[PDB]
């Protein structure tokens, strides 16, 4: 079950209200392995509290680290089905234009399809 | 003397009728008047397909890559196009009866199905083990690119600089540093991307087309579901590509006709292209790299971004 499947809409809305109040300078982000992704491993924790100043490039490096990936391994972080146009984009901006109706900012990570 | 209905080369072209130019690795052709040139350019590219009856990999492994080597083959093709540009030039063209430059056979030899060839299926599959890929395991674009980079190290003849830009970002400073190493090592720039979850947003299509319109264009590797192809251009809303999905006997000497696809180029709807790809560019000189950067800047939505540090 994904994060959205483990907690109801109302529950998540409340999760966000609580976190945004306790941490006004933090962005609540849910990062999960794309449902069609099988090469990359699964995170131990998919709920993140990200400082609003952090940009995508920085976030990506952290997730790569968490996943214990080699820089040589393909990794992509997609928001609403697309990689952010610019990695220098602050998470605060991503949150403003891509956040879910429940208040969380959702992202999925994937590598690449294989062919034989 | 008999007069024959000499079926000219490009008479077999099966191109659609709506005349948008035809782009092949940085070259634009008219489907109306340059059918010969289009087919020559396509047939000239080094084509690598499945092969059977080559030396058993690892001595006791497969003697054919049918069914599992398709992406490795696409990797071979795009890297070979880089070597062709690096050693023969983008303007070089292959001719079935014309004696080719010795440098041509050196490039081809590097991809022959032999253990000692720099980029042979044997070398790629074995090097892939180090990348976490078992022999016979399917590859994605980046993986084969990473393997080719490691193999290129031993190719002191080409002495290439192979930069694989990860994370949708091309860092010029790192590229310059790599190329200025032991003053500029020809650059093979590979950019592995994931332009969507299951499809490619139409917004990237214009950008994708332009990736084939640059002088430095090496094309793209990726494909349709379960069908990897080496895309070398496009026409209208269709990508043009070389398909490795044909099993041919290992060459027994180098007779080279089987390494040239002398048929109307395969085409598939741009819409069918899966989001997992690797875009390639070749910059022989620092000026070529500067021009490429300028061309990228000129560019609905970008597939990657150019940054200094």
Query: So where are chain B's domains?
Result: 1-309
| Consecutive H or E run containing B228 | strand B227-235
Shortest distance between the Cα of B215 and any Cα of chain A, in A, equals 25
Please tell me the total count of domains within chain A.
1
Distance of CA A60 to the CA centre of its chain: 9
> And the tokens for A89?
């984009």
Which residues touch A106 (CB under 8 Å, ≥6 apart)?
Answer: A3, A4, A29, A30, A32, A79, A80, A100
CA nearest to B271, candidates B218, B205, B220: B205
Of the candidates A76, A108, A115, the beta carbon closest to that of B71 is on A115
| CA B250 – CA B23 distance, rounded (Å) | 31
Q: Give the total residue count for chain A.
A: 116
Which residues touch B134 (CB under 8 Å, ≥6 apart)?
Answer: none
Shortest distance between the Cα of B226 and any Cα of chain A, in A, equals 5
Cβ–Cβ below 8 Å for A87 and B70: no
Backbone angles phi, psi at A33, to 5 degrees: -70, 135
User: Which residues make beta-bridge pairs with B52?
Assistant: B64, B249
Backbone angles phi, psi at B26, to 5 degrees: 85, -5
Task: Give, in order, the Cα–Cα distances in Å from A89 to each of A56, A69, B59, B125, B295.
Answer: 6, 23, 51, 39, 23
Q: How many CB atoms lie within 10 A of CB B229?
A: 27
Cβ–Cβ below 8 Å for A108 and B197: yes
Strand B187-194 versus strand B161-164 pairing type = parallel
CA nearest to A28, candidates A16, A10, A44, A43: A16
What's the angle, vertex CA A79, arms to CA A78 and CA A80, rounded to 5? 115
User: For B206-215, b where at least 16 C-beta lie within 10 A, e where not — what string?
Assistant: ebbbbbbbbb
| CA B31 – CA B37 distance, rounded (Å) | 9
Shortest distance between the Cα of B203 and any Cα of chain A, in A, equals 11
Of the candidates B131, B140, B164, the beta carbon closest to that of A111 is on B140
Strand B227-235 versus strand B217-224 pairing type = antiparallel
Cβ–Cβ below 8 Å for A72 and B196: no
Cβ–Cβ below 8 Å for A34 and B169: no
Which residues touch B145 (CB under 8 Å, ≥6 apart)?
Answer: B75, B164, B190, B192, B278
Mutation pick from B135, B166, B205, B273 vs chain A, by most beta carbons of A within 10 Å, is B166
Of the candidates A81, A86, A113, the beta carbon closest to that of B274 is on A113
Chain A residues near residue B192 by CB distance under 8 angstroms: 74, 112
Backbone angles phi, psi at B256, to 5 degrees: -115, 10
Which residue of chain B comes nearest to A112, CA vs CA? B276
Chain B residues near residue A116 by CB distance under 8 angstroms: 67-71, 138-139, 226, 228
Task: Output the domain CATH number for residue A35.
Answer: 3.10.20.90
Shortest distance between the Cα of B274 and any Cα of chain A, in A, equals 8
Cβ–Cβ below 8 Å for A112 and B194: yes
Q: Are B46 and B259 in contact (CB under 8 A)?
A: yes
Q: Which domain holds residue A45?
A: 1-116
Chain A residues near residue B207 by CB distance under 8 angstroms: none
Shortest distance between the Cα of B106 and any Cα of chain A, in A, equals 27
Shortest distance between the Cα of B36 and any Cα of chain A, in A, equals 32
> And the tokens for B213?
């319109």
Q: Please, which experimental method was used? A: X-ray
Which residue of chain A comes nearest to B68, CA vs CA? A116
Chain A residues near residue B194 by CB distance under 8 angstroms: 74, 76, 78, 83, 110-112
């Amino acid at each position: 079950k994904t994060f959205k499947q483990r907690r109801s809409f109302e529950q998540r809305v409340e999760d966000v209200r609580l976190i945004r109040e306790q941490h006004p300078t933090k962005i609540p982000v849910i990062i999960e392995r794309y449902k069609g992704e099988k090469q990359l491993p699964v995170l131990d924790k998919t709920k993140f509290l990200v400082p609003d100043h952090v940009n995508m490039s920085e976030l990506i490096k952290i997730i790569r680290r968490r996943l214990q990936l080699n820089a040589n391994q393909a990794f992509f972080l997609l928001v609403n089905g697309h990689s952010m146009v610019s990695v220098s984009t602050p998470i605060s901006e991503v949150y403003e234009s891509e956040r879910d109706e429940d208040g969380f900012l959702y992202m999925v990570y994937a590598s690449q399809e294989t062919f034989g | 003397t008999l007069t024959y209905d000499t079926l000219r080369f490009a008479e077999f072209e099966d191109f659609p009728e709506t005349s948008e130019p035809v782009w092949i690795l940085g070259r634009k052709y008219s489907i109306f008047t340059e059918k010969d040139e289009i087919l020559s350019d396509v047939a000239s590219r080094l084509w690598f397909t499945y092969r059977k009856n080559f030396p058993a990999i690892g001595g006791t492994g497969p003697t054919s890559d049918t069914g599992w080597g398709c992406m490795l083959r696409c990797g071979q093709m795009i890297f070979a196009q880089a070597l062709v540009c690096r050693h023969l030039g983008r303007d070089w063209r292959w001719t079935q009866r014309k004696r080719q430059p010795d440098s041509y056979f050196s490039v081809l030899n590097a991809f022959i199905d032999r253990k000692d060839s720099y980029y042979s299926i044997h070398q790629i599959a074995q090097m892939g083990v180090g990348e976490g890929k078992s022999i016979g395991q399917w590859y994605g674009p980046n993986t084969v690119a990473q393997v080719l980079k490691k193999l290129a190290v031993f190719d002191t003849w080409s002495s290439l600089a192979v930069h694989i830009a990860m994370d949708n970002t091309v860092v010029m400073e790192e590229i310059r540093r790599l190329c200025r190493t032991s003053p500029w090592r020809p650059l093979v720039l590979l950019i592995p991307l994931r332009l969507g979850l299951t499809d490619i947003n139409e917004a990237y299509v214009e950008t994708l087309k332009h990736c084939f319109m640059m002088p430095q264009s090496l094309g793209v590797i990726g494909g349709k579901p379960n069908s990897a192809h080496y895309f070398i251009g496009y026409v209208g809303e269709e990508l043009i590509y070389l398909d490795p999905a044909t099993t041919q006997p290992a060459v027994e000497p180098i007779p080279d006709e089987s390494f040239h696809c002398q048929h109307p180029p395969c085409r598939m709807s741009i819409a069918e292209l899966d989001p997992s790809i690797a875009v390639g560019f070749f910059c022989k000189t620092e000026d070529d790299f500067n021009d490429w950067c300028q061309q990228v800047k000129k560019l609905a939505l970008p597939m990657f971004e150019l940054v200094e540090q």
